[PDB]
């Protein structure tokens, strides 16, 4: 799966 | 209910199990993720031979050995069964419980 | 416009300056992510002191502000960064404040 979280 | 998309980091709490958790609204991930410094320690996780791509990678993360009740204020419920990463900043919820909540994404 | 969020990518097409470009729809970032590899080679880059806490990197972000232009002739302006070895083009919140997109449930 992906994961895009970029504080 | 109806949240505009901000600057601010768009965010939802809920149950998962028996417990609140507050998360950041990721349409960006297809799974969710639990902050391990979050996880309560008698929950069983598992290893997993799966890879989280993003800017970067993680291999193997743990996982939530069973399925969690996630319930919203209004008492819609299901199933989701996330993964439990340390060193993340927020709980992400990913489109595994979203699409379980019908929650649309509109334009005026 | 109207879109289910479901286990498929939710995806967005629009025009950045005279470019088509497709992307996911990514309410997890601040900004706006372009693959270099769609990145055209004469739009000027610049480094930045930005760091990019993932699942860490220290992108390249455009010199100039971009026209966005959705299909409904919506425009604005944004400034994203652009990050090799990333597999789709990535709409920020950056972007998707400036489109004025809700989320919604019944």
Do not use: H
């Not at chain 2, 069983?44 to 799966?50: A, K, V």
């Not at chain 2, 743990?62 to 009740?69: D, P």
């Amino acid at each position: 799966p992906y994961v895009f979280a970029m504080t | 209910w109806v949240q505009p998309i901000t600057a601010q980091k768009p965010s939802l709490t809920l149950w998962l199990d028996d417990k609140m958790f507050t998360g950041l609204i990721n349409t960006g991930a297809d799974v969710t993720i639990i902050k391990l410094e979050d996880w309560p320690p008698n929950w069983p996780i598992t290893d997993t031979l799966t890879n989280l791509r993003g800017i970067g990678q993680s291999n193997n993360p743990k996982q939530s050995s069973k399925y969690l009740t996630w319930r919203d204020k209004e008492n819609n419920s299901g199933l989701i069964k996330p993964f439990v990463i340390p060193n993340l900043p927020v709980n992400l919820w990913g489109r595994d419980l979203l699409s379980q909540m019908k929650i649309m994404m509109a334009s005026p």
